[PDB]
Design a protein around this nucleic acid. Sequence first.
RNA 1: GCUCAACGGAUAAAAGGUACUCCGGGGAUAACAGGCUGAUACCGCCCAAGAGUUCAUAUCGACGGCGGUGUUUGGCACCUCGAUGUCGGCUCAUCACAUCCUGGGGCUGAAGUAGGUCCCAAGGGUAUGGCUGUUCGCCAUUUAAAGUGGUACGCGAGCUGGGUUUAGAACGUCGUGAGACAGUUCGGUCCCUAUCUGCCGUGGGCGCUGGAGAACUGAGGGGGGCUGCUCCUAGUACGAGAGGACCGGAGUGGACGCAUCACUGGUGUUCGGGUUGUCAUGCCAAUGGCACUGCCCGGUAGCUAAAUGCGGAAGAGAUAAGUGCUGAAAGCAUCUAAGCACGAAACUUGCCCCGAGAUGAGUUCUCCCUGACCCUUUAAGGGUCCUGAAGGAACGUUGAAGACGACGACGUUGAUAGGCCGGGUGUGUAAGCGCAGCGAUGCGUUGAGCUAACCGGUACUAAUGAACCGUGAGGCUUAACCU
RNA 2: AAUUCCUUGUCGGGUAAGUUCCGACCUGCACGAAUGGCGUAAUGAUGGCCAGGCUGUCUCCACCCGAGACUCAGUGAAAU
RNA 3: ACACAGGUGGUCAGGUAGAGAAUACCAAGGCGCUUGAGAGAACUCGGGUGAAGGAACUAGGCAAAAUGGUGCCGUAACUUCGGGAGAAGGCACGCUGAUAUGUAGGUGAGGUCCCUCGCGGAUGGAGCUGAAAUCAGUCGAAGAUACCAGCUGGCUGCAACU
RNA 4: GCUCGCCGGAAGACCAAGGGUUCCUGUCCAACGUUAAUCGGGGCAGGGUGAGUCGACCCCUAAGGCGAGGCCGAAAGGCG
RNA 5: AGGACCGAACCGACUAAUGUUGAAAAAUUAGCGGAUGACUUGUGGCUGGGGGUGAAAGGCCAAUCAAACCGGGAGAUAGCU
Lengths: 123, 54, 119
Amino acid sequence: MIQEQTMLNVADNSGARRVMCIKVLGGSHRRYAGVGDIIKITIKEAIPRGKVKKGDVLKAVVVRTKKGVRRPDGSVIRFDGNACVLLNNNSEQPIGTRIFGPVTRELRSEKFMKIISLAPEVL
Amino acid sequence: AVQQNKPTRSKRGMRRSHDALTAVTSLSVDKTSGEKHLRHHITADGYYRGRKVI
Amino acid sequence: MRHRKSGRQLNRNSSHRQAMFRNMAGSLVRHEIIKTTLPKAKELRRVVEPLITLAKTDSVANRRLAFARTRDNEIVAKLFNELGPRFASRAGGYTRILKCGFRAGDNAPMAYIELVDRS
RNA sequence: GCUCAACGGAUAAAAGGUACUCCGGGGAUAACAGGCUGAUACCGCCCAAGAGUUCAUAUCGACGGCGGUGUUUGGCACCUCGAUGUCGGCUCAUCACAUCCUGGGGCUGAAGUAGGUCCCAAGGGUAUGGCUGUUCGCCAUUUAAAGUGGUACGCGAGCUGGGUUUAGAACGUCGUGAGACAGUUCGGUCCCUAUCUGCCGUGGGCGCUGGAGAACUGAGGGGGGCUGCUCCUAGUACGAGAGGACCGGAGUGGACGCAUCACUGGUGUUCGGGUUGUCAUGCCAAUGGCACUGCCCGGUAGCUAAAUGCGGAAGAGAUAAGUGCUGAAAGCAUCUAAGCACGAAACUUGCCCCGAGAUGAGUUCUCCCUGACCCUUUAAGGGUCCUGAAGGAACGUUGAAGACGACGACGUUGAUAGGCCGGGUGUGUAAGCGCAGCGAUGCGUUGAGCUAACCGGUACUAAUGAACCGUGAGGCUUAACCU
RNA sequence: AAUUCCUUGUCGGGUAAGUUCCGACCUGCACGAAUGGCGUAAUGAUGGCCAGGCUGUCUCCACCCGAGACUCAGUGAAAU
RNA sequence: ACACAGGUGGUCAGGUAGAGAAUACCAAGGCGCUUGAGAGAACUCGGGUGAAGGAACUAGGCAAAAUGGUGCCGUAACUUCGGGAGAAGGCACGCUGAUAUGUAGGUGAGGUCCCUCGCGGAUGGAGCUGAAAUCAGUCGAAGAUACCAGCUGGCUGCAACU
RNA sequence: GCUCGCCGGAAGACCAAGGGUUCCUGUCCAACGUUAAUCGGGGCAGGGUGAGUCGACCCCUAAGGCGAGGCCGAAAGGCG
RNA sequence: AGGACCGAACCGACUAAUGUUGAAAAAUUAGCGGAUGACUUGUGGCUGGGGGUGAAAGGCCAAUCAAACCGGGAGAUAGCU
Ligand SMILES: [Mg+2]
Ligand SMILES: [Mg+2]
Ligand SMILES: [Mg+2]
Ligand SMILES: [Mg+2]
Ligand SMILES: [Mg+2]
Ligand SMILES: [Mg+2]
Ligand SMILES: [Mg+2]
Ligand SMILES: [Mg+2]
Ligand SMILES: [Mg+2]
Ligand SMILES: [Mg+2]
Ligand SMILES: [Mg+2]
Ligand SMILES: [Mg+2]
Ligand SMILES: [Mg+2]
Ligand SMILES: [Mg+2]
Ligand SMILES: [Mg+2]
Ligand SMILES: [Mg+2]
Ligand SMILES: [Mg+2]
Ligand SMILES: [Mg+2]
Ligand SMILES: [Mg+2]
Ligand SMILES: [Mg+2]
Ligand SMILES: [Mg+2]
Ligand SMILES: [Mg+2]
Ligand SMILES: [Mg+2]
Ligand SMILES: [Mg+2]
Ligand SMILES: [Mg+2]
Ligand SMILES: [Mg+2]
Ligand SMILES: [Mg+2]
Ligand SMILES: [Mg+2]
Ligand SMILES: [Mg+2]
Ligand SMILES: [Mg+2]
Ligand SMILES: [Mg+2]
Ligand SMILES: [Mg+2]
Ligand SMILES: [Mg+2]
Ligand SMILES: [Mg+2]
Ligand SMILES: [Mg+2]
Ligand SMILES: [Mg+2]
Ligand SMILES: [Mg+2]
Ligand SMILES: [Mg+2]
Ligand SMILES: [Mg+2]
Ligand SMILES: [Mg+2]
Ligand SMILES: [Mg+2]
Ligand SMILES: [Mg+2]
Ligand SMILES: [Mg+2]
Ligand SMILES: [Mg+2]
Ligand SMILES: [Mg+2]
Ligand SMILES: [Mg+2]
Ligand SMILES: [Mg+2]
Ligand SMILES: [Mg+2]
Ligand SMILES: [Mg+2]
Ligand SMILES: [Mg+2]
Ligand SMILES: [Mg+2]
Ligand SMILES: [Mg+2]
Ligand SMILES: [Mg+2]
Ligand SMILES: [Mg+2]
Ligand SMILES: [Mg+2]
Ligand SMILES: [Mg+2]
Ligand SMILES: [Mg+2]
Ligand SMILES: [Mg+2]
Ligand SMILES: [Mg+2]
Ligand SMILES: [Mg+2]
Ligand SMILES: [Mg+2]
Ligand SMILES: [Mg+2]
Ligand SMILES: [Mg+2]
Ligand SMILES: [Mg+2]
Ligand SMILES: [Mg+2]
Ligand SMILES: [Mg+2]
Ligand SMILES: [Mg+2]
Ligand SMILES: [Mg+2]
Ligand SMILES: [Mg+2]
Ligand SMILES: [Mg+2]
Ligand SMILES: [Mg+2]
Ligand SMILES: [Mg+2]
Ligand SMILES: [Mg+2]
Ligand SMILES: [Mg+2]
Ligand SMILES: [Mg+2]
Ligand SMILES: [Mg+2]
Ligand SMILES: [Mg+2]
Ligand SMILES: [Mg+2]
Ligand SMILES: [Mg+2]
Ligand SMILES: [Mg+2]
Ligand SMILES: [Mg+2]
Ligand SMILES: [Mg+2]
Ligand SMILES: [Mg+2]
Ligand SMILES: [Mg+2]
Ligand SMILES: [Mg+2]
Ligand SMILES: [Mg+2]
Ligand SMILES: [Mg+2]
Ligand SMILES: [Mg+2]
Ligand SMILES: [Mg+2]
Ligand SMILES: [Mg+2]
Ligand SMILES: [Mg+2]
Ligand SMILES: [Mg+2]
Ligand SMILES: [Mg+2]
Ligand SMILES: [Mg+2]
Ligand SMILES: [Mg+2]
Ligand SMILES: [Mg+2]
Ligand SMILES: [Mg+2]
Ligand SMILES: [Mg+2]
Ligand SMILES: [Mg+2]
Ligand SMILES: [Mg+2]
Ligand SMILES: [Mg+2]
Ligand SMILES: [Mg+2]
Ligand SMILES: [Mg+2]
Ligand SMILES: [Mg+2]
Ligand SMILES: [Mg+2]
C-alpha cells in the first residue's frame, strides 16, 4: 500500500538509497500501489557518484511491501520494509544491473523479466 | 429555534392523544389463596402458584 | 452495535459493576435470599452458579480462587461446607427468581432471588 | 457706510477629528444581496474584401450589420437599516447544455494513427500536490476527461474565522493637529434544547362493508447506467517509409456501490499472563483494591477495512442528428408529399428494491361461530338471557431484530433465556508438594491451570391453570342459473 | 524592508512544484541617523520558514470504555 | 440573588516509597457531593487502541501524538568571555550472594586514667543506623518498568534583558 | 450492622474576619430541599455560652483623623 | 552574591476544548509563565469627578467610566418615531 509522500528504499544499485513517491499510475484517484505497479518518485538521498543524483524524478516499480502480497490460497507474504527499483520515464526499464534482497512471484511479467533474473531469491 | 405562531387546543389534544394510558388487561388468581395479583408476580402475602415463599 | 454480545453495563463501569456483584453474591450466600432489581438478579446468577460449581469440588486451589473472587472467608467457608454437598446433585439451576413488583422511589421492577434449596 | 458673493441677507465676530464613541430617525438614502434594462460581458447569426500555392466559405475572417442569456464591470434605487450576516475554504448536493470524456453522424486541403470544424445527445464520470486567506492564477505529475454557469457571486439556527470590518501598537505617506489611507505588518468572544413546511426512517387509529390468518398480481415510485490497459483478428487494410487500422472477441485492473467475516489485520477497559509503588486478607506463600484498563504483552465472539464475492450489461420497441429504397407534384431529377427500412451511453422496457390508503382501497388457497326472547321510533332500529369460536391482544423467556414502538422464536405436548457437561479457541507449564542451589531462581508433577460473547447436548431454574379483546351466517337494486 | 503601488521586480539557495523564507542587485511611488540609523552575545506563553523524530491532522476511518441523548417513576422552566 | 463546580487570612503536618509540603497508596479523622432504574440507536463531550504511509489535512505541526530521572564520557558556530549548554548525541539502572555473616562513614554505651572533680576530657569499641562501588549469577519482550517527570536543531525581523 | 469506593499539606482538626442560634433534645410534616421522605442548617417548644491566668477592656504610640487657643478664608469652612 | 535556573504553595492568565436562556452576569479540564524579588498577601489609613489614580490600555474609581452614583433644576428640548 504505497501512496504519495511515502518514503522507500532502493533495491537496485543506481546510486539512490531513499526516495519519495509523488504519484501512482493506473487511473484516476489511484492511491494505493502494490507490487508490480508503476509509480513516480523523486530522489531524496543518493550516493555521491552514481547513475542518478538528488532531485531527479523518474518512474519506479515496487518489489517489496510491508503490507505484503496475498496469494490465492490466503498465504500472505510480508516484509520488514518498503523498497523499490528505479526505471526510465520512456522505456520503463531498470537502470541498475543488480537487485538487492528477495522479490515476489507476483512480479514476473514480460516487462519485468530483467528483475527476477537478477534477484538472488524469488518467493 | 422557537415558534412563530401560537398552536391551538386542537393540535395540543391531537399530540396528547398518544399520551394516554393503557390499563391492565386482566389479573391472575392464586389456586389456593384466591387473591388477585399481577401475571408472573407474587402476591402481597408471599404466595406464588399456590406455594408459600415468605 | 450489540450483536451476539453479553453482559449489562447497568450504568456503571467495570470496577464498580464487579464490586457490586461481588457484594451482592456475598450477601446472597450469607442470607440465602435477597431482594433486588430484576436485571441485577438475572446477572447475579452468572456469578453465583459458577461459584457454587467451584465449591462442589473441595480443594485448596478452588478455595483460593473463591477467596480471590469474594474476599470473604466467612462466605467461602459456608459455600464450601454447606452449599457444596447441598447442590452436588443439581446440574445447574442453583437460583430461583420470583418477581416482587415495583418500587416507590424509582418504580423500578423488583424481585426476590434465592437458593432453590432454602425451605 | 456691508464681493451680508451662502447676493430676500440666521451673529458686529467662528476651523477640524472621532475606528473610544452616543441619541432620535430613514430602506425618503448608502455597500453585499434580490428587482427592471442590457450601455458593457459572453454567445449565436447575415454580405463577402480576402488569407488559404489556383480556388471566399477544409479552417479563419476585415471594413459593416442583426439578434439571444441576464454570468461579469455596470445604470435606477422598487423590498428589506424597530438587522435579509457578507469573501474564501470543508461536508452536502441539485438543475440547464452554448458538452471536457464516453455515444452516433456530416465535411475535410480526412492515404492510416493522430487530427480541425459542425449537428444530435446530460445516462454516467469529471484529479492529487507546492505558492497565496485568496476564487482566479503559476508550476510538478497523472487522467479516457480534469466542463461552462445558476442555485442570496448555493449552503455559518451545518462547520471554519485565514482576510475583509471595532476598540491595542507599529512602518511608509498626508495633515502644524486631534487623526486619515480597499497601502502594509503582530494579535484580536461566530449564541439558539426545532413550533410549522421539507427530508431521511419507524409506528398507533380507522377504512377498504362478516371476521381472521397467509401467499401474490404490480398501477406507480425509487436505485444503478462511467471506463482505462494488454492480446487475437493483424504488423493485415492503408502508406514509396517511418508509422500504423475500422468493425468484432478474450483477459486483467483503477475510482463507485451492495453484501459478508471463511481467510489477512484493527478494536476487543467482560479472557489469560508479565511487572512497578502502596494498602489489606493475624504472618510466609498465594491473592484482592487503587494509581488512564496502573503500565504493558497476546487474544474468543461480535463490529469492522486495508480483506474477498458481485454489478454496471447482453437483448427488444419507438427515435434525434444522419444514411437510404421506390417514387410524383415539376414527363427528368428528387430520402417524402402516399409507402417502406437502418440508425446513439438520449426515452420505455429489460437488472435490483419499495409498493393495493392504487379510497380506482385489487387477486387467490384456507379457517370460524347455522341459540332463543321481548319493546316503538316498524327499522341497515333498541334492549335481555345464553353463548365468547377462528384469531388477535396482554404478561414472561428472548434474538446476529431494535432509540421507544415495531418484527421474528419459544412458553411444561419445551432447548426461548439463564445455569451445567463435553468439545473448541485464547492466554501460556496454575496453586500445593518434592528436589538442586547460601540465596534470587530453576526443575518434575504439567502444554498444566484458567477460559467472555463459540459449538454439540442437557429442563437444573425461570417461561403458569387462567383471564381479556374479538361473535353468533353477514345491506339495497339489477343480470344469468337452479327451483 | 514591519516601509516597494506597479510586484509573484530579477538572480541564486532550499522543494519534483515555493505570491511564504534566506542571501544578493538598487529602478528608495514614499529608509535614514537621539519622534535616532546599522549590527549585536543571552532572553521571548513574540512574527515567519525549513529539517529529524513523533503520531487518526489526513489518506479513510474502525472498534472499545464512561457521561448525556432513548424508555419508565416523581418535580418541573424559558426565549417566542 | 441559589443548599452556586467560583473567592477568602493565620496554625497543626503521621507512615511507605521519594530530593521534597510535587505524585501514588494509606492511618487518626471525614465523605459517596439530595432525583433513580432500565436498554446499550444516530449524534455530543472526556478518553483508550489501531493494519501501510507519516503533516501529504490545515491560513498555520491548532490540537493530538512523542522524549521526559540519577550517575558518567562528551558537546559546534558565536560571544559583552558570564554564556550558548541540560547543547546535540551516547552508556549503566531490577533482584540475589560475595567483597563486607551490614563496607566506607555517622552515632555512640559499659568498663579504663587523672581531674579544677561533673550536664566534664583522652583512651574504647559494645550496640544502632547506614550509602555508594566491583565481581558472579539470575527472571521477564521491556528494570528512570506505576503517578510525577525538557522534544530538538538551523535561518531570520522586532524588542537589549527581568 | 456487614462489605465497596474517595480526600487525606485534605474533601482532616483549631481559629481570627464575617454571619448571629444555624449548637443539643423532644416533636411536626402545611411551605423549603431542583423527587419522595419517618430526614435536614425546613416549622413549634424547651435547654445550652461559667475566666485574676484566653481575648476584648486598659498603658503606650505608627500611618492617619479631630483639634483649646492660633493662622487663613465672601458664609460654610481649610490647615495646624 | 545574583531584578540567576528547574520545579511545589502563592500570583497571573499564553493555547486548545467544554460551556455560552452555562456549575459560573468571564468560569472548568489538559497544557503554561514568574515563583528571594520592580514579589505576593492580611489589617488599618489617605488621594474623588472636569477630579483622584494610572511601568500609560482612554485603563480603574463598588458587576456601570471619552468624565462614577443619588437627589434637585426637570414634565430640560426634540422640526424625530
Ligand atoms: Mg413573523
Ligand atoms: Mg407525547
Ligand atoms: Mg446471547
Ligand atoms: Mg441514568
Ligand atoms: Mg481502575
Ligand atoms: Mg452697513
Ligand atoms: Mg433668490
Ligand atoms: Mg442609533
Ligand atoms: Mg428605496
Ligand atoms: Mg444592488
Ligand atoms: Mg429582497
Ligand atoms: Mg484569392
Ligand atoms: Mg445587477
Ligand atoms: Mg438593512
Ligand atoms: Mg423585524
Ligand atoms: Mg450585519
Ligand atoms: Mg447540443
Ligand atoms: Mg433525463
Ligand atoms: Mg436508459
Ligand atoms: Mg512544506
Ligand atoms: Mg454566498
Ligand atoms: Mg460562508
Ligand atoms: Mg437562516
Ligand atoms: Mg482574523
Ligand atoms: Mg478602510
Ligand atoms: Mg495609500
Ligand atoms: Mg440542533
Ligand atoms: Mg399503519
Ligand atoms: Mg474476519
Ligand atoms: Mg470465526
Ligand atoms: Mg488478530
Ligand atoms: Mg488489549
Ligand atoms: Mg476480530
Ligand atoms: Mg498489588
Ligand atoms: Mg506476599
Ligand atoms: Mg482501598
Ligand atoms: Mg422519379
Ligand atoms: Mg431516387
Ligand atoms: Mg457502458
Ligand atoms: Mg489449545
Ligand atoms: Mg515449573
Ligand atoms: Mg497466576
Ligand atoms: Mg506447579
Ligand atoms: Mg515438559
Ligand atoms: Mg469449559
Ligand atoms: Mg532593516
Ligand atoms: Mg505587495
Ligand atoms: Mg525564486
Ligand atoms: Mg530578502
Ligand atoms: Mg528619501
Ligand atoms: Mg522612521
Ligand atoms: Mg522622515
Ligand atoms: Mg541630527
Ligand atoms: Mg529626528
Ligand atoms: Mg529604537
Ligand atoms: Mg516535518
Ligand atoms: Mg428522555
Ligand atoms: Mg411563560
Ligand atoms: Mg446541593
Ligand atoms: Mg460553594
Ligand atoms: Mg506525606
Ligand atoms: Mg456510548
Ligand atoms: Mg490515543
Ligand atoms: Mg501506546
Ligand atoms: Mg495508524
Ligand atoms: Mg497490536
Ligand atoms: Mg505501525
Ligand atoms: Mg517517519
Ligand atoms: Mg501543505
Ligand atoms: Mg491542500
Ligand atoms: Mg502543540
Ligand atoms: Mg515544563
Ligand atoms: Mg539583515
Ligand atoms: Mg521579512
Ligand atoms: Mg521585551
Ligand atoms: Mg536596538
Ligand atoms: Mg485512595
Ligand atoms: Mg497530595
Ligand atoms: Mg446572612
Ligand atoms: Mg430558626
Ligand atoms: Mg443539628
Ligand atoms: Mg430536630
Ligand atoms: Mg406526604
Ligand atoms: Mg418535597
Ligand atoms: Mg434550588
Ligand atoms: Mg431546625
Ligand atoms: Mg493575658
Ligand atoms: Mg498624630
Ligand atoms: Mg478654633
Ligand atoms: Mg486638622
Ligand atoms: Mg529569580
Ligand atoms: Mg493582569
Ligand atoms: Mg488574553
Ligand atoms: Mg489551569
Ligand atoms: Mg508551570
Ligand atoms: Mg521558576
Ligand atoms: Mg484594607
Ligand atoms: Mg464629571
Ligand atoms: Mg457634579
Ligand atoms: Mg486610542
Ligand atoms: Mg466598573
Ligand atoms: Mg471601557
Ligand atoms: Mg460633561
Ligand atoms: Mg427649567
Ligand atoms: Mg421627557
